[PDB]
Every structure is written in structure tokens, then in C-alpha cells.
């Protein structure tokens, strides 16, 4: 036929891509960072515990001031917390209790959330009525909302389980751009520090790098066996880490277009729910289904610490923009601030 | 007592928020949450017709001092294992199966009949790790159409291992036993089975009778016995 000739053309292009990226692999990152002196044992102790949620916390997002954080749980509430004093600043009752994601705007005026109702609702925090209001609701996905991330007060990238990411204009309510190309449910999303790129990992063991202005897929990253649940950019904007269900974190470089490091252990057999980097990018913190978090030395692939405070699965984590603390939320209804 | 005036008023605001959160969690804790599963054309829609009269569809009904919330998740065409843990801790799972889909082959592909598809879905959610202890109310729907269709098209179309009568009650009891035989661990969870048509008006009484046992078990867990 002709479509089989086109798929032989696609297989020729795929092994050309693989040979051109194995031509770049001259030395691994474990050879470059061999004589780098190790991190040592990272002993982070839990400093606060945020106790107001009554169900499983599915997401959390730090504000840009590194003090306020929002957390969404499936009792239909999202609480904004003051992490310094453990105070509750607001508690927003959600219209659908089945939240999977929550986002904080970098201005601090908006929070977004969404989930199994396929809508990223957007909540105005800075109202002169004194109560939080639903400013906009963004329908247009045909699968569940799995990640929302703000760029401005007027733009938000939402990833979803209809194999599609989308860029939204908030004040009109319409999708500006649709990002298609994944063949499984897009589970995670991480914007670049310049917010001109974002990576999105899906359930087809793939991570794709998207240009927000052009609307296209620039690079596609493989290496995982199972569904990528977590994705997080490096602070340089030149690499990212993906966590997946095959009990493995992997670091992928953008300008090299392949995988640099893999963070595995033979005791680790459960999937990875959340990843984030520290402020330097030296530590890769990863949350697990074995109820604890592991601190990975991201340059040497050595386990540098265990954050072992939770009684159920760590579903969400975030490092502050200060670099000062890690928040880890979990299915046991608690947020813990670690330092 | 080393707080400011505004820090003390923020602590008072956070305690009022905690009071409203505690009261809303108490109001949500006395509500019966029901997953509604089943394949297509299995009579889920006539059951949502029977109880009260994009995304997840929520249905509320109150029946004899008990507020129910029924979640239909048939709309989301996604990989189910990425969100099925959201309904961990649901009170029961209502599973609708059309009895008349024993001979009806699936329109997705004609190698799979619809009763084997629903048996695969029941084996998937029955032996889930999130529903190890969750009671399952299995509704076997459209028994009048099954009564008309078992007269001439036998159950050897669907179950070729079956040897029995070509009447309603022997074939229906075989289908119910074939569904109830699908739990790998038959000790932790309870499966309830009820035959349904469009004319029945006691299926909500069957559902209330089945969730009274889950309420008794959770009351014993609240009172420290487990």
C-alpha cells in the first residue's frame, strides 16, 4: 500500500533520530560527575504539619513568595495555608470534589483547580467582597484535568486525560492553542523558567517538549517503561526529570535530546508520584507509593536522604522558590513542611 | 503570647475556617457514596431513572433518613487505573449488567460478546486493590427481555461450557453464579445480586438494605472494634 510505505519512512526517520542521538552520547553524566564530591546524608526534619484536610490530598502548589501554599484534597476544599504560622488563609469549597490538580498564580491573585469534571475552575483570591469567587471556568477538555499551570494572570496551560494539553485565555475562556501528539493520558506538566516551553509526560511512556508560542512539539523523549506520572524542569531550563510507574526517575537533557541519568534502586518497586528539584538543582526529590520521599543526588544518582514522615502515599510535593523548604502532601490528609 | 493584634486575628480567622471545615466534614461523613459502573447498554440509565424518580455525573437521592450520592463515571473515555483510586472509600459499587447482552456481540469488534466484556470489567473492578473490602451491589438488568430471548437462543452462545435448562431461572442463576465466581478472595468483600427490569420499584430498597451492612461495619470501625 502507501500507508505501509509511510510507516517504513517513519521507522527510517526513527532509527535516524536514534543514531543521531547515540552519536552525541560520548560520555555519560556518571563519568563527568565521578570526581564531584558527594552531597552527604541529607537529614531533613519535618518543621510544620498542616492539618485541616479530611481526605486524600491530591495536589499542592507553593506561591511565589515561598510562604503561601494551596493544597487540594478530595473533600471538596482547597485551603490556602500560611506555612510560617500554620494558619489557614482561605478555604475554597469546590463545585466538584474530584480534584486532581491545583495551581497558584505567580501574582498570587488566582488559584486554579480541576479534575474528573474536565473543567479547570479559576478562583479569584483578591476580591473586594472579601470572599473568594469563581472567576472563570474552562471547559473544553474531554478527559479529566490532570495538571494546570499558570503563566500569567490571563494564561494557563492545562494538561488532560484526553491525550491533549491546551493553552487557555482566561478572560475569554477559550483555548488559544491545543497541544496534540501524545497517545496516552497526559499526567503531568511543568513550565520552563522562561515560560516559553513546557514539558508534558503522558501514559505512553513519553515526554514531549512544546513551544507555547508556535504550538508544536519540538522534542520527544523516551526511556521509561510505564506511565510518567511526574515531570519537573531543571532550574537552568536545559533539562528535566520524569518520574514514572516503573519505580525510576530519569533526567533528560534538552540540547542533547536524550536521557542523562536514571535514579533507581532495587528496594524501590513502587511508582513515583511527584518529582521536584532543589534551588541549585543538585537534589532531585521524588515522592513515592512506599509512603516516603527520596532525596536523590541528581549529579551522581545516589540516594542522599529519605523523607519518611507519611502514613500513606506521597501524592504531591513542591520545593519553594526560596529553596528553603519542601512541602510534601499525601493521602493520609497531611502536608508536611521539611527543612 | 508573643503575637501581634493582627496575628491574633489571623489565628481567630484560621480557627473559624477550621470550625467550618470540621462541620462540613461531619456533614459529608454521613452521606452514602456509590460508584455506578457497568459497560454500555447495561441499564445504568434506567437505574438512575429508578433511584431519584462530560465528566463525572453526580446523582443525589434521599431514601429513609439516608442521603445518597451516586457517581456515574461512564462518560470519561480514559485509562481507568489513573483515577479509580479516587473512589477508594466509596460505600458500595453498583454494577449494572444487562442480562439480554449474552448473545449480543459487541459493536467495537465482533470477536467479543458483551457479557464477556462485562465479566472482564467486573473482574477488573472486583479484584482491584482499591476495592478489596468494598461491597458490590450487582444488578442483573433486563430480565424480561432475557426471558424472551432465552426461549430460542440458548446460553451456549455465551457460555459453551454451560449445560442446563433453556428457561429463565436456571440460566439466570447460572449467570449470577458466573459473575459471583469472579472474586479471587471471597472473604473480605460482599457481593449482592438482584434481578431488575424497568417495572421494578424496590431496587432502592435493595440498595439501602445492602448499604446498611456497610454502615454497621463502619459504625463498628468508628467505635473502635474494626
Amino acid at each position, epitope marked *: 500500500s502507501e500507508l505501509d510505505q509511510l510507516r517504513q519512512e517513519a521507522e527510517q526517520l526513527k532509527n535516524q533520530i536514534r543514531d543521531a542521538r547515540k552519536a552525541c552520547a560520548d560520555a555519560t553524566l556518571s563519568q563527568i560527575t565521578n570526581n564531584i564530591d558527594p552531597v552527604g546524608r541529607i537529614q531533613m526534619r519535618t518543621r510544620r504539619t498542616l492539618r485541616g484536610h479530611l481526605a486524600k490530598i491530591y495536589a499542592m502548589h507553593w506561591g511565589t513568595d515561598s*510562604r*503561601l501554599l494551596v493544597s487540594a484534597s478530595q473533600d471538596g476544599k482547597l485551603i490556602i495555608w*500560611d506555612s510560617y*504560622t500554620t*494558619n489557614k*488563609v*482561605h478555604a475554597i469549597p469546590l463545585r466538584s470534589s474530584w480534584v486532581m490538580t491545583c495551581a497558584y498564580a505567580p501574582s*498570587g491573585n488566582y488559584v486554579a483547580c480541576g479534575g474528573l469534571d474536565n473543567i479547570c475552575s479559576i478562583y479569584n483570591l483578591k476580591t*473586594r*467582597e*472579601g*470572599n473568594v469567587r469563581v472567576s472563570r471556568e474552562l471547559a473544553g477538555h474531554t478527559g479529566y484535568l490532570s495538571c494546570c499551570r499558570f503563566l500569567d494572570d490571563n494564561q494557563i496551560v492545562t494538561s488532560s486525560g484526553d491525550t491533549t494539553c491546551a493553552l487557555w485565555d482566561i478572560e475569554t475562556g477559550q483555548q488559544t492553542t491545543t497541544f496534540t501528539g501524545h497517545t496516552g493520558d497526559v499526567m503531568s506538566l511543568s513550565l520552563a523558567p522562561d515560560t516559553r516551553l513546557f514539558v508534558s509526560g503522558a501514559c505512553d511512556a513519553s515526554a514531549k517538549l512544546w513551544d507555547v508560542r508556535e504550538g508544536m512539539c519540538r522534542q520527544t523523549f523516551t526511556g521509561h517503561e510505564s506511565d510518567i506520572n511526574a515531570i519537573c524542569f531543571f532550574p537552568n531550563g536545559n533539562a528535566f526529570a520524569t518520574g514514572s510507574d516503573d519505580a525510576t526517575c530519569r533526567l533528560f537533557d534538552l540540547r542533547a535530546d536524550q536521557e542523562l541519568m536514571t535514579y533507581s534502586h532495587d528496594n524501590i518497586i513502587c511508582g513515583i508520584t511527584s518529582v521536584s528539584f532543589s534551588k541549585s538543582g543538585r537534589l532531585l526529590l521524588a515522592g513515592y507509593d512506599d509512603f516516603n520521599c527520596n532525596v536523590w543526588d541528581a549529579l551522581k544518582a545516589d540516594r542522599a536522604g529519605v523523607l519518611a514522615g507519611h502514613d500513606n502515599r506521597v501524592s504531591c510535593l513542591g520545593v519553594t522558590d526560596d529553596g528553603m523548604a519542601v512541602a510534601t502532601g499525601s493521602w493520609d490528609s497531611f502536608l508536611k513542611i521539611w527543612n | 503570647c*508573643t503575637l*501581634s*493584634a*493582627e*496575628d*491574633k*486575628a*489571623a489565628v*481567630e*480567622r484560621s480557627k*473559624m475556617i477550621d470550625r467550618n471545615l470540621r462541620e462540613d466534614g461531619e456533614k459529608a461523613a454521613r452521606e452514602v457514596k456509590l460508584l455506578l459502573l457497568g459497560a454500555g447498554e447495561s441499564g445504568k440509565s434506567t437505574i438512575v431513572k429508578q433511584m431519584k424518580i462530560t465528566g463525572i455525573v453526580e446523582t443525589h437521592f434521599t431514601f429513609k433518613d439516608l442521603h445518597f450520592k451516586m457517581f456515574d463515571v461512564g462518560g470519561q473515555r480514559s485509562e481507568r487505573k489513573k483515577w479509580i483510586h479516587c473512589f477508594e472509600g466509596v460505600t458500595a459499587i453498583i454494577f449494572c449488567v444487562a442480562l439480554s447482552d449474552y448473545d449480543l456481540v459487541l459493536a467495537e469488534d465482533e470477536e467479543m460478546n458483551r457479557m464477556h466484556e462485562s465479566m472482564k470489567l467486573f473482574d477488573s473492578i472486583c479484584n482491584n486493590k482499591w476495592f478489596t473490602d468494598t461491597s458490590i451491589i450487582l444488578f442483573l438488568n433486563k430480565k424480561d427481555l432475557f426471558e424472551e430471548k432465552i426461549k430460542k437462543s440458548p446460553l451456549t452462545i455465551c457460555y459453551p461450557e454451560y449445560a442446563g435448562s433453556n428457561t429463565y431461572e436456571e440460566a439466570a442463576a447460572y449467570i449470577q453464579c458466573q459473575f459471583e465466581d469472579l472474586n479471587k478472595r471471597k472473604d473480605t468483600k460482599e457481593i449482592y445480586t438482584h434481578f431488575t427490569c424497568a417495572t421494578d420499584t424496590k431496587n432502592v430498597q435493595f440498595v439501602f438494605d445492602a448499604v446498611t451492612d456497610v454502615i454497621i461495619k463502619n459504625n463498628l470501625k468508628d467505635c473502635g472494634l474494626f
Partner: single-chain antibody
Amino acid sequence: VQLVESGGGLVQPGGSRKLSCSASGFAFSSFGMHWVRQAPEKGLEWVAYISSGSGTIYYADTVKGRFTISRDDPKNTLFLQMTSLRSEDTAMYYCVRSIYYYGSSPFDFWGQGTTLTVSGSADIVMTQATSSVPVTPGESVSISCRSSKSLLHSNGNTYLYWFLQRPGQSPQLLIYRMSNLASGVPDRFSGSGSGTAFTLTISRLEAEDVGVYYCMQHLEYPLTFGAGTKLEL
């Protein structure tokens, strides 16, 4: 957002009056409420406070025992039951809404005020040393306030609030917590200071900035204002 104070008028001395302020257009139950009076050409004087949820009530010691502040949260109405009314209680009484969380704007909306005409060394003294600055438009004007105590707290906030009362109007908040600009306020206004010495810089003054300017501390109850600094064209 609107607050209409009602009551007041000719009250015999020793008598009684209930002031009432109906609130419309905002989530009234989450705001703490204040009464702030103003003697017929004196400065602002804080009277009472009720919390959100009514769980914390303060009074000035000038009115303690004689005044009772109470809110009715379904009817959206704040009351000040005033007994034993003296000739010093002749004032114009403002309702002020004030919400308190991390990063909130207290004292941000003031009511129009009703006129009642009846016919404390531990308090932080806010001293506005200048009382009148005559100024032509276009100029950059600084207004200085001085505090008896260091308004800087150990959490890092210095609780100093700036208000402007235009002629024939309610005071409106210009600056909260010594530097943060209020909503609906131009960036002409700026605030600075260490503990005990504070500045309000009106850069490039327009004709709408004419009025009396008040500092206020919110570090400790009772809340105390400055005497006020008049600006004239």
C-alpha cells in the same frame, strides 16, 4: 461595598442611643468591624471592635462599660448600643470593616458616618508633629508621624496605617503596614520608616490629595490615631 450608619441626633446627656450600620455588597460575616468616632473638629478616635464570629471584642477605655458593640450576621448589621451619653460623646461615628489574614488590607472601607450630638498611659501615642502644610499642586510632599513605641514587631511587620480624610468625606486607607499601597490608590503615595518614625510621601501632588492625613497603629489594642495633618491649596 457599602456601609450606611444610622441613628444619632439630639440626645440628652446621661441618656441613650443605639447606632446601627447596615452593610451591603460584601461578605459581612468574615470582616471584623470597628467603630471610629470623630469629635466635631478633632481627630479620629477608635471606639470599639468586634471580631468575625463575634468571639473577640475590644473597647477604648473612654467608653468601656457604657458602650456595647454587637453584630447580627444574617441581617448584615452592626450595632453600637450607647448608654450614659456624655457631652464628650458628641462625634460623627464611622463603621470600618477590617479583615485579617496574611496579606490582607484592614481598615480599608469606611462608612459615611452618622452624627451624634449629645447636648490611658499604656496606649501608644502617635504624634503627628506638623498639623498644617500649605502646598501648591505638582510638588512632592512628605508627611511625618512619630510613634511612642516601636511599631516593628518580631514577625517583621511594622503596623502603621495611613488614612486620608478629604473635606466632607470619610477617611480612606492610603497605606497599610507602613509601606503597602492600598487598592484604588495611585502610586503618588509612598510609605517608609524604621520603628517609631514614619513618612508618607505624596509625590507630584494633585488637588484631590487635599485633606487631613492620619497615622494609625495596629500593633496593640487600643488603636490610636495621630492628631492629623491638614493640607491646603
